[PDB]
Design a protein around this ligand. Structure first.
Ligand SMILES: O=C(O)[C@H]1O[C@H](OP(=O)(O)OP(=O)(O)OC[C@H]2O[C@@H](n3ccc(=O)[nH]c3=O)[C@H](O)[C@@H]2O)[C@H](O)[C@@H](O)[C@@H]1O
Ligand SMILES: O=C(O)[C@H]1O[C@H](OP(=O)(O)OP(=O)(O)OC[C@H]2O[C@@H](n3ccc(=O)[nH]c3=O)[C@H](O)[C@@H]2O)[C@H](O)[C@@H](O)[C@@H]1O
Lengths: 638, 215, 101, 110
C-alpha cells in the first residue's frame, strides 16, 4: 500500500517506523522545520518534504499525483483541508494524544496533568472536518501515576502509540473500518496554553498546584509565581498535606521550602530565581531571600479633534468611565462646552496643520492617540483634492510617526471608503478587495489617501513595532454631525444635508437617481465599539483592522429621506419650518462637480468587531433619524 | 478589464494585510496628486505607465541574487549560475512584454509632445502583441540560451521548479494574473505602435547580460 | 563533514549561490573522472575531490528540512555541474597632516 | 527649590515639566506658574521662558548609575545636548545659569 504520512516530533518519529514496520510503502513524509522526523526520513532514503501549508495547488495537486492509498497524521501541527483528505481512497487517520473523545483540543498531554487525570492514552481516529472528532479505531490507554510528570508521561504515551501501531496498523492494510462514532456531548476541546497560564494560584488545593507544576515540568515553561517582583519558577514539588496554619501564599519553612495553600502546603524541590540556573529548594529560597512572607495611575487618551463628529461623543464616553484622563486638541471648543470644566478632561489649543511640537509633546504625555482630524466630505475631494490629501494624509501621518517614535498606541480611524466600489457581499477588512476609479475620478483622492496611510501604519506596526488598531466606521450619524451653517456649503455628510433642505425649504436632491444603498450606524453603537477597542480587553485589538458598522440598517438615500420626512412631520416643530420643497433627481456633476464617482452598495463585515469586542449594533435606523433631526432642529433660533 | 484603459479601467488591490500593494497604492496616490495639481494649479504633466519593459541594462546580475530584480533578468541569472528557474505559483500568469526600443520611442514622443497632445493625458506604453506567460517566457529564454554562441561556457541548465508565493516573496504577497495595455492614447497622441517582437527582446537581453560577464 | 555533523553547525558549500549543508557522507575512492568539485550523479549524489569523490548521504539546502542526498540535489536541481569594484575611502581633511600621506 | 523660593518674598517661579504629580501643593500658588514642557522637544516655549526670566536652573537630567550603561545615548543626548541648548539660550538672552554640575565629575579622584 501507498501511505502519505504527516509526522512531526517524537510521535511522528515513532509512527513513521510503525507504518514502515507494518509493511506499507512510504512515498511521502511531510513535516515542519526544526528526536526528529526530518533526519529520520532522511537516513531512511525516504523523500521528505516540509511545506508551509500543505493545502496548496502545488502540493494538493501533487500529493494525489503520487497515488496515495492511506494518509496517516502523527502529531501534525497544521490542519488538513478536506480536499487533501479525500486524496487517499482508504482515507486519512490522525493519532491524537488524549483518550478521545476527551481533550480533543491541542497539546492535551499537559492538560491531563493540570486537571489531575487518572488515565489517558492514544486514540487513532478518522480525520473529519470536525476538530479531532472522527471515529475511534484503536485506543491503548495509559495510566497516570502519582509521580508522573510531563517528560515521563510523554515517553510513556509515546510508547503507547509505538505499541498500538504494531497491531491495528498491519490489520488496516486490507481495507477494514472497525470504527465507532463519538458521543458529541462527551467532548472537551482544550485549546493552546499561553505563557500567562503556567502561573501559580496558591489559593487552591496543593494537589492543584502540584498538578500544575508536574504539567509543565522540564523541558516545559514550568510553574511560576512572584516574590515581590521576582519571577521564579518551580520545576518539581511535593504535595505536603501539612497545613501548618498559614495563609495561602505564606512561606512556612526555607529548608524544606514550603508555601501554604488553601489546604496543606506545597514543598518546592527545585526551581530558578529568574533566568539563573536551576537550584535546590533551599538555595532557591536563598537567592530569593525568603524568610516567612507571602507571595504575590489612570490612562491618558489623546484626542486630536476633540470638538468634532467622533471626538465629542468619544470624550463623553471615555469621561463617564472613572479612570480616564482625556486630552483633546482642537482649534475651537464650540461644541465640547459641556465637559470643558470637567476635571478628567483637559482641552488644549492646537491645529495639526501648524503645530509640530505641541503635538509631539502631548503624544509623549499620553497613552493612546486618536487623530480624529480629517476632512471627509465627498464634495471636498473634487473641490480641494490637494487640501484633502495634505490634511488627511501628510499631517496625520506625521502624528503617527510621533507615536511609533514614542511607543504609543494608535487607534487610527480608517474609513469605509477604503474599500471603494467593492463587489463583495459584505466588506471584509481582511479579505475584501479595494476598487477605485481611474485617476480622472478625483473622488477617490480621499479613499486612496486613507488606505496608503493604513498601509504605512501596517508597515510600522510590523517592521518597527507600532502598537495600532484600525477602525473603519460605516456612515455613523447622530447629533453633532457637521453644522447646518457649514452644511449650506456642501461640506456636510448625507443626513444633515437633507435635514438642511427640510429646514430652509430647499428641494432634497437625490444625486444620480438616489437609489444607492448604504448601511447607517447609530452614534451610540459606534462609540461603544470604539470604546471597546480602546479598552483593548486582552490585546484582542492589537494589529487588527476592526470594522464598526450596523448591517441591520441598509437603506437607500431615497429610503433614508423617506424615513426622515415621516419623522419631520411628526415633530413638534414642523409648523415652525416652511412646507416641504419636494425631491428632485440631479446629475452627480451638478452637485459634486466634475470628476465624481460613487459606490452603489455598502455592507460591513462586523465579524472582527463581534469577535474582538463582544459587540453587535443595536439602535436601528429609525431612532437615529429622530434623534439627529431633533437635535439639529431645536438648535435653531426658535 | 480585458485591456487596461488609463481613462476608464478601475484600480483593484488586495486588503491592507497584503503589503505587495504598498507600491501600487503609492504610485497611484502620487498619480492623483499630480492630476490635482495639473487642474488646481496648472501643472504641466504627462503620465506614462510602462508595461513590463525589458532589454539590455535591466537590473544587475549582482543585484538579482538578492531578489532585487525583475523577472527576465532574474531568470537570466538562473541560467548563468546553474540555478533552477523558479516559476512562482505555477508560473502560468500572463503579461504583455514591451521591448526597450518601442517603449523608449513612445516616451521620446511624449517628451517631444507634438502639439500638446500629451498634456493632462495619461499615456500608456505597452505591446499587446507580446502576451506571454513566465512559463512561456522561460522557455523562449532557454531556447535562445542554447543557440547562443556562448552556450558552452556556462554550466548546465538546472531545471524548472514550481515554488509557492510565500516561499520566494514571503509574507503578504499577491499577484496580477493578466496584464494587457490599451495603447490607444499612445497611438492617438504619439502616432506610435509597438514593432519589435518578443524573440528579439529575449535574444538581445540575454546576449548583453551574457557577454557582460567575465569569462 | 563528520567533525561538525549534527547537532553541530555542519559542513557546507555553494550551489552557485545557495547555501547547502552536508550532514552525512561516504568518502568514495572510485576516482570517477571529473573536475574536483563536479557533480557525478544524483542518486547517489557524488562530487569529485582530488583523490576520488565525496558521496552525499543526507543534507539540507538552505534551512528547509534535512533530506536524502538525492532529494537534496533535486531541491537544488543538479546534473554534472561544478560547486561554485574597489573600496571607497572618504577622507575629511584630505589636505593636511595625515591625509596627504 | 520651588517651595523654598515660593516661601521667600519676591520670587515669581516658572516651572517647566511634563507632569505635576509631585508639585501639587503649590500649583495654584499665585507666585508659581507651571508650564508644560519637555526640553527634548520644545525649542520655542523653553527659549521664550528663558527670555522672560532672570535666572535659569536646568534641573532636567538623567542621574542614575544604571542608565549610563543601559541607555548611554539618551543619557548623553539629554544630560548634555539638550541642556547645552538651554545654556546657549541663556548666553544669547543674557541670563544667569545656576547650573547643576555633578559629584561624578571628579570620578575616581584621589
Ligand atoms: O462614514 C462612511 O462610510 C464614509 O462615508 C462617506 O462617503 P459617502 O457615504 O459617499 O458620503 P455621504 O455624505 O454619506 O453621501 C452618501 C450619498 O448620499 C447621496 N446624497 C448626498 C447628499 C445629497 O444631498 N444628496 C444625495 O443624494 C450621494 O449619493 C452620496 O454619495 C465619506 O466619504 C467618508 O468620510 C465616511 O467615512
Ligand atoms: O515593469 C512592470 O510592468 C512592473 O514590474 C513589476 O511587476 P511584475 O512584472 O509583476 O514583477 P516581475 O518581477 O517583473 O515578475 C513578474 C512575475 O513573474 C513571476 N516570477 C518572478 C520571478 C521568477 O523567477 N519567476 C516568476 O515566475 C512573479 O510572480 C512575478 O510577479 C513591478 O511590480 C511594477 O512596478 C512594474 O511596473
Amino acid at each position: 500500500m501507498k501511505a502519505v504520512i504527516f509526522a512531526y516530533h517524537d510521535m511522528g518519529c515513532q509512527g513513521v517506523q510503525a507504518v514502515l514496520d507494518a509493511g506499507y510503502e512510504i512515498a511521502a513524509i511531510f513535516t515542519h522545520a526544526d528526536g526528529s522526523v526530518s533526519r529520520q526520513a532522511a537516513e531512511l532514503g525516504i523523500p521528505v518534504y516540509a511545506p508551509d501549508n500543505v493545502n496548496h495547488p502545488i502540493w494538493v495537486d501533487r500529493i494525489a499525483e503520487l497515488a496515495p492509498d492511506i494518509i496517516f497524521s502523527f502529531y501534525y501541527r497544521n490542519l488538513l483541508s478536506e480536499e487533501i483528505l479525500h486524496l487517499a481512497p482508504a482515507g486519512a487517520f490522525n493519532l491524537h494524544g488524549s483518550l478521545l473523545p476527551a481533550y480533543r483540543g491541542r497539546a492535551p498531554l499537559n492538560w491531563v496533568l493540570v486537571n489531575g487525570e487518572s488515565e489517558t492514552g492514544v486514540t487513532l481516529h478518522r480525520m473529519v472536518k470536525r476538530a479531532d472528532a472522527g471515529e475511534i479505531v484503536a485506543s491503548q490507554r495509559v495510566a497516570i501515576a502519582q509521580d508522573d510528570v510531563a517528560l515521563t508521561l510523554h515517553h510513556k504515551l509515546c510508547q503507547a502509540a509505538r505499541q498500538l501501531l504494531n497491531s491495528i496498523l498491519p490489520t488496516m492494510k486490507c481495507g477494514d473500518i472497525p470504527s465507532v462514532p463519538q458521543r458529541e456531548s462527551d467532548s472537551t476541546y482544550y485549546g493552546r496554553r499561553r505563557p500567562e497560564d503556567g502561573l501559580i494560584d496558591w489559593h487552591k488545593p496543593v494537589s492543584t498546584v502540584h498538578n500544575l507544576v508536574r504539567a509543565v515540568a522540564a523541558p516545559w515553561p514550568g510553574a511560576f509565581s512572584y516574590n515581590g517582583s521576582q519571577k521564579f519558577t518551580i520545576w518539581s514539588s511535593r504535595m505536603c498535606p501539612d497545613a501548618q496554619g498559614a495563609l495561602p501564599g505564606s512561606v512556612i519553612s526555607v529548608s524544606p521550602l514550603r508555601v501554604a495553600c488553601a489546604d496543606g502546603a506545597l514543598e518546592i524541590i527545585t526551581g530558578q530565581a529568574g533566568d539563573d540556573i536551576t537550584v535546590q529548594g533551599s538555595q532557591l529560597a536563598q537567592t530569593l531571600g525568603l524568610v516567612a512572607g507571602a507571595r504575590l495611575r489612570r490612562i491618558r487618551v489623546l484626542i486630536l479633534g476633540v470638538n468634532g463628529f467622533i471626538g465629542n461623543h468619544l470624550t463623553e464616553r471615555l469621561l463617564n468611565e472613572e479612570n480616564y484622563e482625556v486630552y483633546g486638541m482642537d482649534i475651537g471648543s464650540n461644541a465640547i462646552s459641556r465637559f470643558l470644566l470637567h476635571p478628567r478632561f483637559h482641552f488644549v489649543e492646537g491645529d495639526i496643520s501648524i503645530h509640530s511640537e505641541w503635538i509631539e509633546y502631548h503624544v509623549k504625555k499620553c497613552d493612546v492617540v486618536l487623530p480624529l482630524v480629517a476632512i471627509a466630505t465627498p464634495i471636498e475631494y473634487t473641490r480641494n483634492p490637494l487640501r484633502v490629501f495634505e490634511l488627511d494624509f501628510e499631517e496625520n501621518l506625521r502624528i503617527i510617526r510621533y507615536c511609533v517614535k514614542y511607543r504609543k498606541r494608535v487607534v487610527f480611524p480608517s474609513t469605509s471608503e477604503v474599500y471603494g466600489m467593492c463587489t463583495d457581499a459584505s466588506f471584509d477588512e481582511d479579505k475584501s478587495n479595494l476598487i477605485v476609479g481611474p485617476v480622472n475620478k478625483p473622488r477617490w483622492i480621499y479613499s486612496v489617501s486613507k488606505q496608503l496611510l493604513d498601509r504605512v501604519i501596517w508597515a510600522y506596526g510590523e517592521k518597527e513595532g507600532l502598537r495600532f488598531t484600525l477602525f473603519r466606521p460605516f456612515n455613523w450619524m447622530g447629533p453633532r454631525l457637521d453644522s447646518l451653517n457649514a452644511a449650506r456649503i456642501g461640506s456636510s455628510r448625507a443626513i444633515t444635508q437633507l435635514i438642511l433642505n427640510l429646514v430652509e425649504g430647499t428641494p432634497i436632491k437625490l444625486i444620480d437617481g438616489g437609489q444607492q444603498k448604504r448601511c447607517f450606524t447609530d452614534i451610540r453603537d459606534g462609540i461603544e465599539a470604539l470604546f471597546r477597542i480602546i479598552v483593548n480587553d486582552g490585546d484582542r485589538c492589537d494589529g487588527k483592522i476592526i470594522n464598526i458598522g450596523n448591517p441591520d440598517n441598509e437603506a437607500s438615500i431615497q429610503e433614508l429621506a423617506t424615513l426622515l420626512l415621516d419623522s419631520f412631520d411628526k415633530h413638534p416643530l414642523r409648523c415652525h419650518f416652511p412646507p416641504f420643497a419636494g425631491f428632485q433627481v440631479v446629475e452627480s456633476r451638478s452637485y459634486y462637480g466634475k470628476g465624481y464617482q460613487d459606490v452603489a452598495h455598502r455592507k460591513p463585515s462586523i465579524d472582527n468587531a463581534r469577535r474582538c469586542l463582544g459587540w453587535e449594533p443595536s439602535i436601528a435606523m429609525r431612532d437615529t433619524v429622530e434623534e439627529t433631526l431633533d437635535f439639529f432642529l431645536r438648535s435653531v433660533d426658535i
